[PDB]
Ligand binder design. Structure first.
Ligand code: NA
Ligand code: NA
Ligand code: NA
Ligand code: NA
Length: 59
């Protein structure tokens, strides 16, 4: 799967995690470290870690 979609808005705590809005689409850069994945928003062109329980695969 290339794109994942945000299920809800998320407000990040630090510069590590990425704030995003429901419906944004992301490419996943790295999901190998755990359930928080480094991701690149196609909607905003920003990157950071996102909680994988806040996204679903676009398929
Ligand atoms: Na942030
Ligand atoms: Na954002
Ligand atoms: Na993982
Ligand atoms: Na998920």
């Amino acid at each position: 799967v290339t794109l994942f979609v945000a299920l809800y808005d998320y407000e990040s705590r630090t510069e590590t995690d990425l704030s995003f809005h429901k419906g944004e689409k992301f490419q996943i850069l790295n999901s190998s470290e755990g359930d928080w994945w480094e991701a690149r928003s196609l909607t905003t062109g920003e990157t950071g870690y996102i909680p994988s329980n806040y996204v679903a695969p676009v398929d």
